[PDB]
Amino acid sequence: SYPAIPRIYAETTLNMLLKRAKKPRVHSIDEYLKDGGYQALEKALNMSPEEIIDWVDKSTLRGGGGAGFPTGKKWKFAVQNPGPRYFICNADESEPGTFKDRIIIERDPHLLIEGIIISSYAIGANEAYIYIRGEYPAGYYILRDAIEEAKKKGFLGKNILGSGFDLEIYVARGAGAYICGEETALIESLEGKRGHPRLKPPYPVQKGLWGKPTVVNNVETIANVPFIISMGWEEYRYIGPSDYAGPKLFPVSGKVKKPGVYELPMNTTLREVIFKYAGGTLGNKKVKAVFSGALDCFSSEELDIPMDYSPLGFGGTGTVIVLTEEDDIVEAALKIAEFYEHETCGQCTPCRVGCYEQANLLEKIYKGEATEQDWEGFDFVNRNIQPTSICGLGAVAGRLIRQTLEKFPEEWEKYR
Amino acid sequence: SYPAIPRIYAETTLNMLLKRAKKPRVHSIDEYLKDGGYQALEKALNMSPEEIIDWVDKSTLRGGGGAGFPTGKKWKFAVQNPGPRYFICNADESEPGTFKDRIIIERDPHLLIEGIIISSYAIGANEAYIYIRGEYPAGYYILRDAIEEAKKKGFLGKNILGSGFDLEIYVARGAGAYICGEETALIESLEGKRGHPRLKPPYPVQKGLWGKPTVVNNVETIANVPFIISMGWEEYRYIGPSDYAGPKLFPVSGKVKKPGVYELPMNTTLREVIFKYAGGTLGNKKVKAVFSGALDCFSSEELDIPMDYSPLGFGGTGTVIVLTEEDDIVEAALKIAEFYEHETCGQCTPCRVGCYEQANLLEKIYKGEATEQDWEGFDFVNRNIQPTSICGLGAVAGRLIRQTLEKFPEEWEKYR
Amino acid sequence: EFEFPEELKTKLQEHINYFPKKRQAILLCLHEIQNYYGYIPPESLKPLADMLELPLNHVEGVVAFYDMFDREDKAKYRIRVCVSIVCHLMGTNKLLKALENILGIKPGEVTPDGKFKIVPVQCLGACSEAPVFMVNDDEYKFESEVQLNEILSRYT
Amino acid sequence: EFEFPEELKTKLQEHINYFPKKRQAILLCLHEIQNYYGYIPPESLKPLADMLELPLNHVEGVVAFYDMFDREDKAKYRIRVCVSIVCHLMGTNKLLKALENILGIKPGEVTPDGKFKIVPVQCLGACSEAPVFMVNDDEYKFESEVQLNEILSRYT
């Protein structure tokens, strides 16, 4: 018996990541096994680590955490360094509009656990972590129970299936900080400290948990790994375009008829996501903007872009927040500003003061209480959050808002 | 996009069954949820099955299919028999004058669906059926869609809301036979056969679908169940008189100003239905008779009867077909005879030949071509349809016509 | 020698997979067959039986039992006219007359073009909107000749 | 002095024994303490620090850092209301207004009886079901006041 969870709508054309998670309920190990689950693992343990890395490499799998970094390449880097090595599943998912990872955690936990075990074997890690945000209490309890189920069936512990490979997966809970999703702050938090990002380089694969080689991957990323081993990398690469192959999840929210998570190939356009899959807009109103979480803002002139990791592509986590023609862009930008205000960790001075002043001045503008200096000040700070920043929050906290400024000048100009 | 449906007027003094179905359009799951929909289900799943049966029992809820059988008591019979068990919603509605069930199906499908889930749970049924007449295609598509909406919101499927209770609702369509609304013929039809009633006993609750305990309930009956759980049985029983409590639907047609479906308490009199609610008669002409579907004929001297299931009461489905002073009763009797002629299934000899002969001889009488023998023959067959009959069609096929002979002798004597 | 078109075979197969047992899909399949061809072709019955895993005899008796199915007259549109008590009281005859004036046919008959067939039916469960008729799945109250003519013009 | 009741001390020990190093258990321990008391008691940090073998300062820094932990206000039920962009756009204000109608309080406030506290939070990762709220660990979509009132009645 688990805490109540809203039943997020989920739809797939590929029937992989969402083969079970398209149904809004916990799938336990018997159901997973009946569907051929844990067979990829068995096949993995009959292969060398190096070979597993090679398949994942050739699959073109990229990170589903937002940066789209090649997964196989990440692993190769870790294994160049002396052990012991650690594996970490990043389930902090706290970006606005992003709710793709939780339906895997909550509905198909064994797909993730299987992925963690294969991934851990591939990089020689005998100890793995799931770090799950504290606002996912049900996911936590569900994962804990699924791990036990896996233990009882001999998929975890010492000498898994006679292979000689040992693994325990520990589940850690966050406690309210967006920043703990940043991989170095994640690790700090796992070490029992505050969530303060560290300067990269070193990257985790060189120095991470207790200073040792560490691979951090996103929940979605890891959930692809059982499929790659199962189908082979060639069959995997047929899904979608050859360069950006395989399933990708798209959490779609806001002014669409069918908000939810869509499993789609990456040659899908943004227009297709909204109109073909998500059922079009509420009230059949015109699209005004799409917010890619709190990262980017696309105008209605940018809907014919692919949902891939190309230069002209949507990229990111695939998060699609739709705003229509009546929605005030300044009001929406204020909400993005308020978010970064609440989540700067404060180690870097321009980020600390910039995120705060961006929100505080934008609120003045919004309420019509802004002096001329407040306006000029707002412009300035928006452009000056980034300098000296040691992590990506500082580098992007002004990005989306700047984009609204450039793409909707007429609506901003009206706030004078 | 559904098939065209006439916009049947609906009016309520109670605001329960017709709370939404008073507006002639489909109400999808979002509107249903806004009105507190599916919260009764959630409360139901935190009660035991036995508790739910007690509540339905204590509500005084009776069947709205026409026989007024106590619903609680029906359920109690089923659950004393070993499982597995089946739940059936009877949406065959094909009695002349009767169009009360369709407005629930077509306008507020989730009220019915919610009812089906709670009732199935109460009797331990993991598989339920809606059997809807073939001449209601819109209701069919509307139900299919609504069931999908419920699945997506997690109200159907396996382990509903973490309760451990599984349910699928299948929707079957009839194909032209009034007899398939008889509960045992309905079951025969669901099994993929001709609609031939079975000898009772056994009743379905002992032996029904695939020979297993089966509860058949009428649409309107099932639609009451969410209210009973939501209000509790005590509060529900405050509606109307305490012996025949709760809402009832009355489809009114013929020579009234405001024909349509009325949601009313059962202490309402027949005269109130026609004059207080249905706007009185077309042309303020005197009431001649009321046909209770094809079952009973009430004269102008019987309008002050309660619309309840007392011995002196209207009873039935609540169908009120009004004829006024200029309407020829023999002509109307002919139409009723023709109905039974077309719908006897012919398994039983007196029903087979009797239904045909009643209509055939009455036609001759109407057209002024009846011999003395035809007259005496018509009287005799009218009184001799029922012997050996194994279902209620043969039991009543002479009933209304007999009543017109007794209550309107002057008009019949005109034809002789 | 008789095979269903693939786009129809698929639909039939969907119905058969829908219920826990195949034979429960029989009336849905038949509806689909009639929807597709404009009637039940006799030669369709043999292979429907196979797919249902039923004797042909079972299937034939089912078709004959259920009044909605029609093995004789192909028609693109079926005008179902209620001939029961309430509609008869409120003007079935006026509706039948209007249909004859517009289309040139009476109950039981089919227009020369195979477009329209009038089917007399019992009560359609819409008695408060009497007199009632359907055009395939669509259902209407008859108001007048001119109103009926407009409605019929929508079926091409 | 302050000392944890035995049934809580046991659970803190289970968390501390779960990870390879004691200090990794800090956040689970603090979630546990908050679950037990309805808040983080200031006087609980000292003995927790000894069990973690960490300085008191380190523990205090952590509590202040992580937004979920509250050291000011006891409450039996925490109603976490999302105030980020998607919930705001789809009707956070309607949820808050409904909350004020039923409970008589606004974000940041506790009811007199110490039963409900409303905590505005950032995106909860259920944006498709906006507007979102939690009642302790239970998470829901807000539909209407009548729906909300029914849900809240479940917490005694």
Ligand SMILES: NC(=O)c1ccc[n+]([C@@H]2O[C@H](COP(=O)([O-])OP(=O)(O)OC[C@H]3O[C@@H](n4cnc5c(N)ncnc54)[C@H](O)[C@@H]3O)[C@@H](O)[C@H]2O)c1
């Ligand atoms: N899913 C969510 O809830 C969520 C929340 C906030 C932000 N994000 C995303 O986070 C992204 C920023 O993440 P980031 O700063 O970690 O990105 P990054 O580009 O710095 O690194 C991405 C990944 O690649 C690895 N990497 C990169 N270069 C490497 C190298 N030379 N050697 C070894 N490893 C290397 C990093 O260690 C990391 O694991 C944004 O694009 C945003 O979309 C997601």
Ligand SMILES: NC(=O)c1ccc[n+]([C@@H]2O[C@H](COP(=O)([O-])OP(=O)(O)OC[C@H]3O[C@@H](n4cnc5c(N)ncnc54)[C@H](O)[C@@H]3O)[C@@H](O)[C@H]2O)c1
């Ligand atoms: N709504 C319509 O379109 C429509 C059409 C035709 C007929 N009807 C109605 O059908 C009615 C007759 O139906 P019927 O023959 O099912 O009535 P019935 O009295 O024989 O049965 C009523 C219900 O109670 C159950 N029941 C009765 N005695 C039982 C017992 N001893 N143990 C267990 N269960 C028992 C039956 O199984 C059935 O479900 C008529 O009054 C007529 O109004 C309605």
Ligand SMILES: Cc1cc2c(cc1C)N(C[C@H](O)[C@H](O)[C@H](O)COP(=O)(O)O)c1[nH]c(=O)[nH]c(=O)c1N2
């Ligand atoms: C502020 C901030 C917040 C987050 C991140 C970044 C930054 C800058 N990242 C990305 C994270 O650091 C890292 O790139 C990924 O977890 C690596 O996994 P993949 O390569 O995507 O599999 C991130 N990733 C993830 O998996 N879940 C999350 O919740 C977040 N949150």
Ligand SMILES: Cc1cc2c(cc1C)N(C[C@H](O)[C@H](O)[C@H](O)COP(=O)(O)O)c1[nH]c(=O)[nH]c(=O)c1N2
């Ligand atoms: C010929 C004939 C035709 C019908 C029926 C009976 C007979 C004799 N019955 C009544 C049916 O057998 C049964 O009593 C009810 O369906 C049981 O449900 P309730 O107890 O009324 O909810 C019936 N009931 C119903 O709900 N819809 C219908 O269309 C019909 N049709």
Ligand code: SF4
């Ligand atoms: S950029 Fe901002 S969030 Fe990132 S480490 Fe510096 S102060 Fe913290």
Ligand code: SF4
């Ligand atoms: S009484 Fe008439 S309708 Fe009923 S089973 Fe016998 S023949 Fe058929």
Ligand code: FES
């Ligand atoms: S009598 Fe014609 S629809 Fe009922």
Ligand code: FES
């Ligand atoms: S914006 Fe509220 S849950 Fe995401």
Ligand SMILES: [Cl-]
């Ligand atoms: Cl193998």
Ligand SMILES: [Cl-]
């Ligand atoms: Cl209202």
Ligand SMILES: [Cl-]
């Ligand atoms: Cl055969």
Ligand SMILES: [Cl-]
């Ligand atoms: Cl006539």
Ligand SMILES: [Cl-]
């Ligand atoms: Cl006829």
Ligand SMILES: [Cl-]
């Ligand atoms: Cl100390």
Ligand code: NA
């Ligand atoms: Na979920």
Ligand code: NA
């Ligand atoms: Na967190």
